[PDB]
Amino acid sequence: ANGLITKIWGTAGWTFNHAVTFGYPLNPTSDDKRRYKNYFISLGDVLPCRLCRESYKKFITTGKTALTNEVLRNRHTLTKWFYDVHNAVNNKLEVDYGLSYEDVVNKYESFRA
Amino acid sequence: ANGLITKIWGTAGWTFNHAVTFGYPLNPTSDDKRRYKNYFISLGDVLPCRLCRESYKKFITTGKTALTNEVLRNRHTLTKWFYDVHNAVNNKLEVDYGLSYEDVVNKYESFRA
Ligand SMILES: Cc1cc2nc3c(=O)[nH]c(=O)nc-3n(C[C@H](O)[C@H](O)[C@H](O)COP(=O)(O)OP(=O)(O)OC[C@H]3O[C@@H](n4cnc5c(N)ncnc54)[C@H](O)[C@@H]3O)c2cc1C
Ligand SMILES: Cc1cc2nc3c(=O)[nH]c(=O)nc-3n(C[C@H](O)[C@H](O)[C@H](O)COP(=O)(O)OP(=O)(O)OC[C@H]3O[C@@H](n4cnc5c(N)ncnc54)[C@H](O)[C@@H]3O)c2cc1C
């Protein structure tokens, strides 16, 4: 019983991590790509819910949600990828917020510093 | 121009990561220690704020907030360590919340699955 109910960390986890993708450079270096890739892989090892970890790991290594080098090309590809991952999880949970990738871009860019 | 104002990611970041520490095993294996250690080091590479990343990296490599092997001993040590890191950032920002470690444990344990 090492897991915590999603009520406390679920949304915070999504918001923080979407913000992370929007802080990615428009034109990243080889180091930026390596660092962010390692972060998102490690993220799967620490989600406070076993089933969540298993599902996440499956998503980032299969289909269009797979974390590949193409996903790390730029801010656009990284933000789109995580957006897709979030939708993949939503669908598995039988929900769909009908939010377009553009709605998300407009939302997070409103917080650009 | 890659940063985001803290209003969107600050609180979410603390909440999600404190939750991560409470999901850590009571009696971790060498593998668990390595995986969580790598995650918390990588977290410093992706905060969407330049000086925030620098401060965090300095906090986890020096002083009482250093991420040493002892911090990874068990759930108690890892959760206390991140509570200390949060207080270190608070002190740097001249913010005082007065929350005790016991208050934090009570809050997150109430969501124990
Ligand atoms: C990596 C990760 C894996 C998870 N895996 C599981 C799991 O396997 N099983 C389980 O029970 N729970 C899982 N969760 C939790 C879950 O996805 C929810 O956070 C939770 O069920 C709470 O639901 P919610 O309806 O508040 O919405 P969230 O999905 O918490 O609410 C997110 C908010 O973001 C918006 N949003 C919706 N879709 C998108 C999108 N595609 N992009 C950007 N914003 C969007 C809306 O504004 C919405 O209110 C996971 C969380 C994370 C962070
Ligand atoms: C690693 C990291 C580094 C950051 N660096 C900076 C920075 O350099 N400059 C800047 O302006 N902002 C920074 N921020 C943001 C900042 O820490 C706040 O999140 C933000 O100012 C909003 O403040 P808030 O009052 O909601 O409090 P947070 O500090 O967001 O609010 C956390 C909430 O957690 C609780 N809490 C407070 N202390 C503790 C504790 N020790 N342990 C557990 N819970 C506690 C209270 O319930 C509180 O409402 C950083 C965030 C992270 C996640």
Curated annotation (Swiss-Prot), chains A, B:
Q: Which residues form the ERV/ALR sulfhydryl oxidase domain?
A: 2-108
Compartment(s) of residence: Virion
Q: List the disulfide bonds.
A: 49-52
Function comment? FAD-dependent sulfhydryl oxidase that catalyzes disulfide bond formation.
Q: What is this protein called?
A: Probable FAD-linked sulfhydryl oxidase R596
**Species per Swiss-Prot/TrEMBL record:** Acanthamoeba polyphaga mimivirus
